[PDB]
Amino acid sequence: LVPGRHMMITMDDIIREGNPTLREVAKEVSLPLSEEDISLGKEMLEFLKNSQDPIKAEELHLRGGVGLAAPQLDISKRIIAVHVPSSLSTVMYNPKILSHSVQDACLGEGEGCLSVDREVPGYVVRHAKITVSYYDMNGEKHKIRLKNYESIVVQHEIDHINGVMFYDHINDQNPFALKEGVLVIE
Ligand SMILES: [Fe+3]
Ligand code: NA
Numbered sequence: 001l002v003p004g005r006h007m008m009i010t011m012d013d014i015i016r017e018g019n020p021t022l023r024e025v026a027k028e029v030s031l032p033l034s035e036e037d038i039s040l041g042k043e044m045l046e047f048l049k050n051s052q053d054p055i056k057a058e059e060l061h062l063r064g065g066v067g068l069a070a071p072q073l074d075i076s077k078r079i080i081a082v083h084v085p086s087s088l089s090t091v092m093y094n095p096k097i098l099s100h101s102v103q104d105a106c107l108g109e110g111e112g113c114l115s116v117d118r119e120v121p122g123y124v125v126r127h128a129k130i131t132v133s134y135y136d137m138n139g140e141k142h143k144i145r146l147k148n149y150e151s152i153v154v155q156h157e158i159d160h161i162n163g164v165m166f167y168d169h170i171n172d173q174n175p176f177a178l179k180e181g182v183l184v185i186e
């Protein structure tokens with residue numbers, strides 16, 4: 001009567017700051033995608049969506065997030081997923097930024113990260129606009145231009161597959177330093 005099966009990412013699966021895995025440069029995924037890499041991708045997206053629904057997030061004790069990277073699950077593979085409420089909801093395999101605007105931006109409230117628990121003061125300067133290239137679960141290759149929030153989320157996730165944490169962009173002694181005309185989103 002009941003079809004197939006799958007797993008569900010639980011908060012315990014998300015490793016925390018200090019875990020060395022978060023600092024490695026994730027490995028490139030092989031194509032065509034394995035049924036294992038496709039599943040992980042799906043498990044990652046289900047999570048983000050789940051963490052964003054009050055009832056599910058609550059019943060499943062999840063912390064809301066809009067982006068996630070395989071390394072955070074302790075899987076060093078270049079795979080990320082983003083789910084931005086109404087607009088952008090996909091899994092990206094071997095994502096790579098091909099170009100960016102000169103214009104910079106940042107989240108006025110500061111970026112979040114399921115992997116860090118401490119509160120980190122400051123602004124993280126990002127490219128207002130970017131063009132990302134990657135592969136979906138089908139094997140289809142995509143090239144898309146993103147801006148503002150979505151651009152920030154993706155840049156934040158790709159940093160993860162390169163062993164980079166958001167607070168690495170924050171000048172510890174001048175946390176809120178910003179150049180002129182930087183678009184602060186909030
Ligand atoms: Fe993060
Ligand atoms: Na898992």
Ligand code: NA
Nearest residue numbers: 111112153156
């Ligand atoms: Na973020």
